[PDB]
Amino acid sequence: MMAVSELEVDGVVFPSLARPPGSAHSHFLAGAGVRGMEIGGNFIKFTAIGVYLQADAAVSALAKKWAGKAADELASDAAFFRDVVTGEFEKFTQVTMILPLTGAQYSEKVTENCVAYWKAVGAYTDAEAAAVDKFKEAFKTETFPPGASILFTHSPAGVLTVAFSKNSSVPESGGAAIENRPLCEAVLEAIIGEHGVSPAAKLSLATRVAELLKEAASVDEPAAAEPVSVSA
Ligand SMILES: O=C(/C=C/c1ccc(O)cc1)c1ccc(O)cc1O
């Protein structure tokens, strides 16, 4: 069993462990990073994003394809981020405001992008339109001042739990629960996927996952300088 370190991103502290809203599973901080936009050739910071994974399950699920790889190989491999997104384990995303945003701004930006992509790939069903209504519904009249958070729990059955906090505190319970795999994945893939808005969170995630898998490989590994066995 292992631990990871805490991360601080432009003043936002993401603890090494958390429990997502609506879940009993402990999660570890897999990666965190700034989300910004280049306007001018100035990098303007909008949010700090922490990506947490199910402590029980994620390493074991990822090791099979990713053990052996250096951080810079995971960081440049679209299939690694896609395995994180689509993994058979729970994920938890925490988006914490650096600049203020409103509920309508955030939800409009994400759902319009989702919808555009789904139409482009020919996979836009009534189920997705109804999931987008439900998502927009949860966000209308929320507003997010600096330090407030948006909280997403991503289930492996493809249920997205949305919740909000006024600060970095993560609440016990969930808010809306949207049973739609495409939107549940899209929300996280919008962050760490090929088109991901946080290259920083991606590089962090690659680096720390690579480290975790390497320490794990070396635990149960026979060395002559440590011969003192505990089996018969
Ligand atoms: O809505 C946002 C920004 C709008 C904006 C408005 C005026 C500007 O000058 C620049 C950006 C926004 C920013 C980051 C994000 O992750 C999700 C979002 O929805």
Author numbering: 0 to 231
Reproduce text from the manuscript describing this model.
In plants, flavonoid biosynthesis begins with phenylpropanoid metabolism in which phenylalanine is transformed into p-coumaroyl-coenzyme (Co)A. Chalcone synthase (EC 2.3.1.74), the first enzyme responsible for generating the basic flavonoid skeleton, then catalyzes the condensation of three molecules of malonyl-CoA with one molecule of p-coumaroyl-CoA to form chalcone. The family of genes encoding CHI in Deschampsia antartica—one of the only two vascular plant to naturally colonize the Maritime Antarctic—was recently characterized at the molecular level.
The structures of unliganded DaCHI1 and the isoliquiritigenin-complexed catalytically inactive S189A mutant were determined at 2.7 and 2.1 Å resolution, respectively. Isoliquiritigenin was bound via hydrophobic interactions with Met36, Ile38, Phe45, and Leu100. Notably, the 4'-hydroxyl group of isoliquiritigenin interacted directly with the NE atom of Arg34. The 4'-hydroxyl group of isoliquiritigenin also formed hydrogen bonds with Thr46 and Tyr105 mediated by two water molecules each. However, ligand binding caused an open/close movement around the strands of the β3–β4 region. As such, we cannot rule out the possibility that crystal packing inhibits the deep binding of isoliquiritigenin in the DaCHI1 active site.
